[PDB]
């Protein structure tokens, strides 16, 4: 006899268009071979909604394409999980957050950017918050028919930044005779679109000096996957045109250290570009900006995320009554907000990485699971307790 | 050739203020006035320590503590005169004292324009139309009113038709946006505090309403409000921008200082909530803290932390005024400061820094050279305050 074990866990987030639908597969092994059950993560096994959700063979949670008119929050905006069960015990998979999106019109805008002659400028493509999870910038274009793409800086002046903005170096009066528009792509429909307004730089020739001034609204804490490229903006306008330096606070201290620039880590004006993120790049960054009148600064936190995995030591044990049983969950990833245990699909209230039963009983036989979580993600491991 | 009484060190009777901001057409008078026996000399220094020269037409030191910045032509701006922190230095035979810093900022009258763009919102949600003012005039310009193409006019104060509110921060708040709400275009009126000029936005904004089919948990934006410094006694509005379908609800908490624990904000007379916006009237220092907006809906939710500091004017005071001490007996000065934040304390003796940052100063054993004036300086980011005291030999 062997308890269930997942062979294929459903992914964590599945987002899809109503025209595309969604197959989600859950595969499990055991001896006897286990039954698969889908549940809402309110605990309840899920029904079939003809046309909308059909549990199939032998995973297998299918969402067929549907009409706007048949959208249903209860089915289509939902967190699910997979439950594999046999005589020996049950295991739950991680959560599967299901988001079906009815394909709808939107439009990105580019507005006027005001800047002091000689400063760098950042033109932003405005995307409404309710498509921003799905829409991203593919390219920039001007009325003079030039086209800018992510990659390298053009003519020492134009760079399309990782976060999709257009960065322009050393803005002069001649730069006001240009109008900019972005191209956006929606990842669920694959549709692309030119922005519905276009923006211009309005340049001031200043007479007075002015210390550097940064905006009221600042980038909130970023979460970036390992091996990805990151750009941190340091918006500032000053006269004379300022200098910019970046730091990282030593983690949990009030001290900071200059960022070192190389191959991998580059600074374009005041923008820090970090290629190939490793978890160690996480931290609290400070941009200090300066000219002969004075200085200002803004902070920006970054977490470099790494995918969770867990494994319990040992994968199985046979323990006498009422001797102790000990399970140790080992995991990998960044960040780890919590560790949680289950027994035959239910919670046990125990959030330390090591589980100890002091003296085993009849009812302790079954499957145990460690779940590790951070706010975008989860990983489970399972283990088997038998009675001597 | 002459004075009576014991010599008394100098002491400021009129301290110059901290920031004077002024247009090129107005100019600036800054007055420093001090006391002592005998009767002290007044010298203006730049805040690298050097005593300042006259620049005819620009900077003239006058009778009888007065630094004067006459009205001047654009062509005549000199950053060295016009963008500068000064101090007042007052001296007599007995000793010397330096005033708190005096940040001087002359600003040449220049054209700017505000803008108001398209705002995209889910029907049924609230919306916040913003007046985009250019960073480099934003210290001097702010919103005075909102106006519509159907000729309606909204002022700071009270809600209109329970629907439109001009937030104390200048944004126009609108409740429960409906499709009919897309046939309105909005402009801001802004006022420049140094020229007193008023203008309307160069561009007008509109609402673009999405009639959504799929549900969406609440979504907050990438860029969020950085830490805010509000003067005591002022009104404050904190925003929680979020769009969601259904229409989400909003709740405000405040963290217990230096813990991970929050408490619900208690809404009443003086603290109110419009949709997701928190309004704090008549701010006290105690209102300072880390605040958290939770936002919700049957699909899931989100949140935005914002830090508020309510600031209070800094003032310092030494105990005593003056003491006489025999040689090899210790002397003791204690600074009593009020205000919010204090970031730092420091000390000087006869205009020079002594490198000592604790509220109470102690000379272990008084020598000949220790006679004279001693000063505490208490500063934050935006402000400074000084105190003085007189040490005599017995
Ligand atoms: C999913 O929803 C979309 C949007 O409601 C449907 O697409 C519409 O299809 C009609 C023709 O069938 C077009 O004329 C419209 O242009 C589409 N609307 C928009 C705004 O995109 C789509 O067919 C639905 N998918 C299904 C039923 O499989
Ligand atoms: C560049 O600008 C910054 C102003 O933000 C200066 O850094 C500050 O320096 C003062 C002391 O002179 C400190 O008390 C502040 O805390 C500093 N801010 C921080 C934490 O960066 C800096 O002095 C300027 N560069 C120079 C040396 O001219
Ligand atoms: C301060 O500078 C402003 C701008 O240069 C001056 O105002 C201008 O005055 C000229 C004539 O003197 C006019 O043609 C402009 O239309 C004005 N423009 C602005 C921007 O107001 C002002 O006179 C200066 N202060 C002085 C000379 O005392
Ligand atoms: C609409 O969204 C918000 C997002 O927070 C949800 O509120 C969460 O409330 C539960 C209460 O037990 C907490 O576990 C969460 O921690 C809250 N927020 C977070 C991320 O910490 C809520 O799920 C949504 N709908 C409602 C009202 O239930």
Swiss-Prot record, chain B:
<feature type="domain" description="Ig-like C2-type 4">
    <location>
        <begin position="313"/>
        <end position="392"/>
    </location>
</feature>
<feature type="disulfide bond">
    <location>
        <begin position="240"/>
        <end position="293"/>
    </location>
</feature>
<feature type="glycosylation site" description="N-linked (GlcNAc...) asparagine">
    <location>
        <position position="296"/>
    </location>
</feature>
<feature type="disulfide bond">
    <location>
        <begin position="32"/>
        <end position="88"/>
    </location>
</feature>
<feature type="glycosylation site" description="N-linked (GlcNAc...) asparagine">
    <location>
        <position position="24"/>
    </location>
</feature>
<comment type="subunit">
    <text>Homodimer (via extracellular region); alternative splicing produces a potential 19,008 different ectodomains and the majority of these show strong isoform-specific homodimerization. Interacts (via cytoplasmic domain) with dock/dreadlocks (via SH2 and SH3 domains); the interaction is direct and may require Dscam1 to be phosphorylated.</text>
</comment>
<feature type="disulfide bond">
    <location>
        <begin position="131"/>
        <end position="188"/>
    </location>
</feature>
<protein>
    <recommendedName>
        <fullName>Cell adhesion molecule Dscam1</fullName>
    </recommendedName>
</protein>
<feature type="disulfide bond">
    <location>
        <begin position="335"/>
        <end position="376"/>
    </location>
</feature>
<feature type="domain" description="Ig-like C2-type 2">
    <location>
        <begin position="109"/>
        <end position="201"/>
    </location>
</feature>
<feature type="domain" description="Ig-like C2-type 1">
    <location>
        <begin position="10"/>
        <end position="105"/>
    </location>
</feature>
<comment type="function">
    <text>Cell surface receptor involved in guidance and targeting of growing nerve axons. Required during Bolwig's organ differentiation for accurate and efficient targeting of photoreceptor neuron axons to their synaptic targets in the brain via the P2 intermediate target neuron. Involved in isoneural self-avoidance during dendrite arborization but not in heteroneural recognition and repulsion during tiling by related neurons of the same class. Involved in regulating axon bifurcation and divergent extension in the developing mushroom body. Essential for axon arborisation in ellipsoid body.</text>
</comment>
<feature type="domain" description="Ig-like C2-type 3">
    <location>
        <begin position="240"/>
        <end position="309"/>
    </location>
</feature>
């Amino acid at each position: 006899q062997k308890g269930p074990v997942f062979l294929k866990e459903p992914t964590n987030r599945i987002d899809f268009s109503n025209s595309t639908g969604a197959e989600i597969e859950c595969k499990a092994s055991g001896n006897p071979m286990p039954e698969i059950i889908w549940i809402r993560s309110d605990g309840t096994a899920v029904g079939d909604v003809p046309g909308l959700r059909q549990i199939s063979s032998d995973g297998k949670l299918v969402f067929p394409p549907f009409r706007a008119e048949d959208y249903r929050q209860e089915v289509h905006a939902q967190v699910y999980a997979c439950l594999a069960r046999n005589q020996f015990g049950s295991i739950i998979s991680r959560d599967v957050h299901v988001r079906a999106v009815v394909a709808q019109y939107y439009e990105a805008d580019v507005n006027k950017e005001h800047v002091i002659r000689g400063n760098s400028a950042v033109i932003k493509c405005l995307i409404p918050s309710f498509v921003a999870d799905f829409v991203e910038v593919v390219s920039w274009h001007t009325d003079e028919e030039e086209n800018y793409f992510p990659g390298a800086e053009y003519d020492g002046k134009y760079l399309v930044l990782p976060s999709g903005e257009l960065h322009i170096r050393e803005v002069g009066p001649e730069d006001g005779y240009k109008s900019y528009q972005c191209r956006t792509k929606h990842r669920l429909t694959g549709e692309t679109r030119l922005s519905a307004t276009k923006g211009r730089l309005v340049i001031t020739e200043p007479i007075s000096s002015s210390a550097p001034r940064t905006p009221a609204l600042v980038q909130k804490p970023l979460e970036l996957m390992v091996a990805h490229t990151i750009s941190l903006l340091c918006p500032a306008q000053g006269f004379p045109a300022p200098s910019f330096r970046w730091y990282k606070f030593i983690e949990g201290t009030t001290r900071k250290q200059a960022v070192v620039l190389n191959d991998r880590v580059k600074q374009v004006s005041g923008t820090l570009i970090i290629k190939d993120a490793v978890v160690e790049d996480s931290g609290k960054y400070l941009c200090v900006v300066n000219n002969s009148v004075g200085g200002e600064s803004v902070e920006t936190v970054l977490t470099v995320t790494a995918p969770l995995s867990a494994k319990i030591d040992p994968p199985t044990q046979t323990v006498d009554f009422g001797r102790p049983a000990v399970f140790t969950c080992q995991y990998t990833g960044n960040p780890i907000k919590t560790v949680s245990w289950m027994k035959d699909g239910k919670a046990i209230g125990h959030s330390e990485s090591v589980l100890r039963i002091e003296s085993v009983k009849k009812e302790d036989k079954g499957m145990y699971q460690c779940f590790v979580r951070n706010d975008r993600e989860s990983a489970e491991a399972s283990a088997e307790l038998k009675l001597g």
